[PDB]
Curated annotation (Swiss-Prot):
GO biological process: programmed cell death involved in cell development; protein polyubiquitination; protein ubiquitination; ubiquitin-dependent protein catabolic process
Signal peptide as annotated in the record: none
Enzyme class: transferase
Cysteine disulfide partners in this protein: none
Loss of function: phenotype: RNAi-mediated knockdown results in reduced ubiquitination at DNA damage sites. Inappropriate survival of male gonadal linker cell.
Tissue: Expressed in the nervous system.
Phylogenetic classification of the source organism: Eukaryota, Metazoa, Ecdysozoa, Nematoda, Chromadorea
The protein's name in its UniProt record: Ubiquitin-conjugating enzyme E2 2
Amino acid sequence: GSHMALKRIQKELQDLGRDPPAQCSAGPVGDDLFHWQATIMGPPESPYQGGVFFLTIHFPTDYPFKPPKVAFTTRIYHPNINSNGSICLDILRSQWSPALTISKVLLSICSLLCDPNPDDPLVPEIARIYKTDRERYNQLAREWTQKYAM
Ligand SMILES: [Cl-]
Ligand SMILES: [Cl-]
Ligand SMILES: [Cl-]
Ligand SMILES: [Cl-]
Ligand SMILES: [Cl-]
Ligand SMILES: [Cl-]
Ligand code: NA
């Protein structure tokens, strides 16, 4: 009894090894199954193309009924990800469902890199630039990718 999160995390880890993603990867940090690290590749047609971005993940005690805590540890220019690596994504808060897995979360973050959401922003200056001056947004996102993520 009382191994809800661990059993779920172990099952996700097993499944991940059997049929992993292409654009991202993840796994536990040593013996601590509650602490994972992940990598996301900048999506190919996005201004993040060529970049490699690292993330840290902590699963809560009541996983899968509460969402994982996920943050970037690589700098990225994006309206939903701030300079501390915090991420604003609905499925990490009010739209979490136990149906979601860490692989699905990571793929959703990849989708968010492809298609930022300035209506749920975390960095208002970037949200405004994205919404109204896409050329500038793309150029800055490319420069940040080249400075920090290659
Ligand atoms: Cl159990
Ligand atoms: Cl297996
Ligand atoms: Cl909890
Ligand atoms: Cl665009
Ligand atoms: Cl540089
Ligand atoms: Cl620098
Ligand atoms: Na968008």
